[PDB]
Design an enzyme around this catalytic site. Structure first.
Site, PDB file in Angstrom:
ATOM      1  N   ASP A   1       1.554  13.744  16.053  1.00 26.61           N
ATOM      2  CA  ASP A   1       1.776  13.618  14.585  1.00 26.61           C
ATOM      3  C   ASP A   1       0.442  13.768  13.844  1.00 26.61           C
ATOM      4  O   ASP A   1       0.189  13.035  12.881  1.00 26.61           O
ATOM      5  CB  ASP A   1       2.468  12.298  14.260  1.00 26.61           C
ATOM      6  CG  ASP A   1       3.258  12.316  12.969  1.00 26.61           C
ATOM      7  OD1 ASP A   1       3.376  13.406  12.348  1.00 26.61           O
ATOM      8  OD2 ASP A   1       3.722  11.232  12.581  1.00 26.61           O
TER       9      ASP A   1
ATOM     10  N   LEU B   1       0.865  -1.206   0.000  1.00 25.68           N
ATOM     11  CA  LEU B   1       0.000   0.000   0.000  1.00 25.68           C
ATOM     12  C   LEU B   1       0.891   1.242   0.000  1.00 25.68           C
ATOM     13  O   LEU B   1       0.463   2.277  -0.549  1.00 25.68           O
ATOM     14  CB  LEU B   1      -0.895  -0.032   1.238  1.00 25.68           C
ATOM     15  CG  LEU B   1      -1.927  -1.154   1.249  1.00 25.68           C
ATOM     16  CD1 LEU B   1      -2.552  -1.295   2.627  1.00 25.68           C
ATOM     17  CD2 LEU B   1      -2.987  -0.912   0.181  1.00 25.68           C
ATOM     18  N   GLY B   2       2.078   1.121   0.600  1.00 27.97           N
ATOM     19  CA  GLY B   2       3.072   2.202   0.718  1.00 27.97           C
ATOM     20  C   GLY B   2       4.192   1.829   1.672  1.00 27.97           C
ATOM     21  O   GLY B   2       4.314   0.629   2.004  1.00 27.97           O
TER      22      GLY B   2
ATOM     23  N   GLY C   1       7.215   3.686   4.869  1.00 28.78           N
ATOM     24  CA  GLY C   1       7.779   4.759   5.708  1.00 28.78           C
ATOM     25  C   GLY C   1       9.201   4.411   6.107  1.00 28.78           C
ATOM     26  O   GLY C   1       9.778   3.489   5.487  1.00 28.78           O
ATOM     27  N   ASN C   2       9.746   5.109   7.106  1.00 30.37           N
ATOM     28  CA  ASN C   2      11.069   4.809   7.714  1.00 30.37           C
ATOM     29  C   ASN C   2      10.984   3.453   8.443  1.00 30.37           C
ATOM     30  O   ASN C   2      11.948   2.665   8.360  1.00 30.37           O
ATOM     31  CB  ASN C   2      11.513   5.950   8.633  1.00 30.37           C
ATOM     32  CG  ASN C   2      12.896   5.742   9.213  1.00 30.37           C
ATOM     33  OD1 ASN C   2      13.865   5.577   8.476  1.00 30.37           O
ATOM     34  ND2 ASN C   2      12.996   5.751  10.533  1.00 30.37           N
ATOM     35  N   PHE C   3       9.857   3.196   9.120  1.00 28.26           N
ATOM     36  CA  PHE C   3       9.563   1.961   9.903  1.00 28.26           C
ATOM     37  C   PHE C   3       9.659   0.705   9.022  1.00 28.26           C
ATOM     38  O   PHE C   3      10.040  -0.362   9.556  1.00 28.26           O
ATOM     39  CB  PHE C   3       8.166   2.031  10.527  1.00 28.26           C
ATOM     40  CG  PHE C   3       7.032   2.079   9.532  1.00 28.26           C
ATOM     41  CD1 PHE C   3       6.434   0.909   9.078  1.00 28.26           C
ATOM     42  CD2 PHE C   3       6.563   3.292   9.041  1.00 28.26           C
ATOM     43  CE1 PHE C   3       5.402   0.955   8.155  1.00 28.26           C
ATOM     44  CE2 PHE C   3       5.526   3.335   8.122  1.00 28.26           C
ATOM     45  CZ  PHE C   3       4.948   2.166   7.680  1.00 28.26           C
ATOM     46  N   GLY C   4       9.288   0.821   7.740  1.00 27.69           N
ATOM     47  CA  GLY C   4       9.121  -0.312   6.811  1.00 27.69           C
ATOM     48  C   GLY C   4       7.928  -0.115   5.892  1.00 27.69           C
ATOM     49  O   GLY C   4       7.745   1.009   5.380  1.00 27.69           O
ATOM     50  N   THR C   5       7.146  -1.172   5.664  1.00 30.13           N
ATOM     51  CA  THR C   5       6.089  -1.192   4.618  1.00 30.13           C
ATOM     52  C   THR C   5       4.718  -1.294   5.277  1.00 30.13           C
ATOM     53  O   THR C   5       4.638  -1.743   6.428  1.00 30.13           O
ATOM     54  CB  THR C   5       6.323  -2.309   3.596  1.00 30.13           C
ATOM     55  OG1 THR C   5       6.204  -3.569   4.251  1.00 30.13           O
ATOM     56  CG2 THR C   5       7.673  -2.201   2.923  1.00 30.13           C
TER      57      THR C   5
HETATM   58  N1  LIG Z   1      -5.399   0.957   7.307  1.00 26.08           N
HETATM   59  C1  LIG Z   1      -4.663   1.136   8.391  1.00 26.08           C
HETATM   60  O1  LIG Z   1      -4.930   0.570   9.468  1.00 26.08           O
HETATM   61  C2  LIG Z   1      -3.441   1.996   8.264  1.00 26.08           C
HETATM   62  C3  LIG Z   1      -2.781   2.443   9.396  1.00 26.08           C
HETATM   63  N2  LIG Z   1      -1.694   3.214   9.337  1.00 26.08           N
HETATM   64  C4  LIG Z   1      -1.240   3.549   8.108  1.00 26.08           C
HETATM   65  N3  LIG Z   1      -0.141   4.332   8.065  1.00 26.08           N
HETATM   66  C5  LIG Z   1       0.450   4.851   6.842  1.00 26.08           C
HETATM   67  C6  LIG Z   1       1.960   5.022   6.983  1.00 26.08           C
HETATM   68  C7  LIG Z   1       2.589   5.601   5.713  1.00 26.08           C
HETATM   69  C8  LIG Z   1       1.882   6.857   5.254  1.00 26.08           C
HETATM   70  C9  LIG Z   1       0.384   6.631   5.112  1.00 26.08           C
HETATM   71  C10 LIG Z   1      -0.233   6.160   6.428  1.00 26.08           C
HETATM   72  N4  LIG Z   1      -0.093   7.218   7.476  1.00 26.08           N
HETATM   73  N5  LIG Z   1      -1.817   3.180   6.944  1.00 26.08           N
HETATM   74  C11 LIG Z   1      -2.905   2.424   7.000  1.00 26.08           C
HETATM   75  N6  LIG Z   1      -3.504   2.034   5.848  1.00 26.08           N
HETATM   76  C12 LIG Z   1      -3.321   2.419   4.514  1.00 26.08           C
HETATM   77  C13 LIG Z   1      -4.334   2.141   3.607  1.00 26.08           C
HETATM   78  C14 LIG Z   1      -4.178   2.497   2.281  1.00 26.08           C
HETATM   79  C15 LIG Z   1      -3.015   3.106   1.845  1.00 26.08           C
HETATM   80  C16 LIG Z   1      -2.004   3.358   2.749  1.00 26.08           C
HETATM   81  N7  LIG Z   1      -0.797   3.968   2.309  1.00 26.08           N
HETATM   82  N8  LIG Z   1      -0.700   4.670   1.175  1.00 26.08           N
HETATM   83  C17 LIG Z   1       0.571   5.068   1.145  1.00 26.08           C
HETATM   84  C18 LIG Z   1       1.218   4.582   2.254  1.00 26.08           C
HETATM   85  N9  LIG Z   1       0.350   3.879   2.982  1.00 26.08           N
HETATM   86  C19 LIG Z   1      -2.143   3.012   4.079  1.00 26.08           C
END
Ligand SMILES: NC(=O)c1cnc(N[C@@H]2CCCC[C@@H]2N)nc1Nc1cccc(-n2nccn2)c1
Length: 264
Positions: free
Chosen positions: A131, A15-16, A18-22
């Protein structure tokens, strides 16, 4: 607490990251499977800060129970450490508005109000997010927002009203100057979150360094009103961006102002 890797399916395509990982999409067989979002720590969770940042988030999510806060399913220890959460099916708010410029002002008010109800509960539970930004609001549906990414969140002790620390564009002046994080500093970040949302996921303070944002805010200047943003919502942004912490509203006052406007 701990999940069976054999009951978890992960899709290959992330899905994407970060620094933490995927972040990976999948499902978990708890009956009926549950669609999940999974934070997978890079490099077999080698870094103890990451493990604490996952545990911190895991431990905060575990303690929180509210319809506008992402729920944790558990931790899975396999190829790496995996934080397994309920899937926010439509993803981060900044990305979704960037790709859906057609979403109506009224729809944006509904979502930022939902964030204000989650933050009101956070403030009542004496947690500071630290944050709060459009990238850390996740859509379940076009009309259902949840707050996520509690990696920097702090449970305040009963004998304190702020966290003293050892994303500057989302930080209130007292965070920058005095390292003090309170529910009031989260209100400031919620102001920047509102600007982001009415700007359809544009970055705040485009092209500016942190020090230049500090300087602009110190001169009493604020980001301009987004194109199409109702005046009452730009008034609330400016109220969230009250310099003096004591006179800045808390989430009780913010949630009530968004409730009344939305339902009228
Ligand atoms: N559904 C969750 O329970 C969930 C919890 N936390 C996060 N955290 C991420 C960390 C990275 C930045 C974006 C976000 N704050 N993402 C989640 N879902 C998610 C669903 C669809 C797409 C994305 N996505 N698009 C790009 C990156 N990640 C994430």
């Amino acid at each position: 607490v701990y999940l069976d890797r054999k009951l978890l399916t992960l899709e290959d395509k992330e899905l994407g990251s970060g620094n933490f990982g995927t972040v990976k999409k999948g499902y978990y067989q708890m009956k009926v499977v549950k669609t999940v979002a999974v934070k997978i720590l890079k490099n077999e969770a080698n870094d103890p800060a990451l493990k604490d940042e996952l545990l911190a988030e895991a431990n905060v999510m575990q303690q929180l129970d509210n319809p506008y806060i992402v729920r944790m399913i558990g931790i899975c220890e396999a190829e790496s450490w995996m934080l397994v959460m309920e899937m926010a099916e439509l993803g981060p708010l900044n990305k979704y508005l960037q790709q859906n410029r057609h979403v109506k002002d009224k729809n944006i008010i509904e979502l930022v109000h939902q964030v204000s109800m989650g933050m009101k509960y956070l403030e009542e539970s004496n947690f500071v997010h630290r944050d709060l930004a459009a990238r850390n609001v996740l859509l379940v549906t076009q009309h259902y927002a949840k707050i996520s990414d509690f990696g920097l969140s702090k449970a305040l002790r009963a004998d304190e009203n702020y966290y003293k620390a050892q994303p500057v564009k989302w930080y209130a002046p007292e965070c920058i100057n005095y390292y003090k994080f309170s529910s009031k500093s989260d209100v400031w970040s919620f102001g920047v979150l509102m600007w982001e949302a009415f700007s359809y996921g544009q970055k705040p303070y485009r092209g500016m360094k942190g020090s230049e944002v500090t300087a602009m805010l110190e001169k009493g200047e604020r980001m301009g009103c987004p194109a199409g943003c109702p005046r009452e919502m730009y008034d609330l942004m400016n109220l969230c961006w009250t310099y003096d912490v004591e006179n800045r509203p808390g989430f009780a006052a913010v949630e009530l102002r968004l409730r009344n406007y939305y339902y009228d």
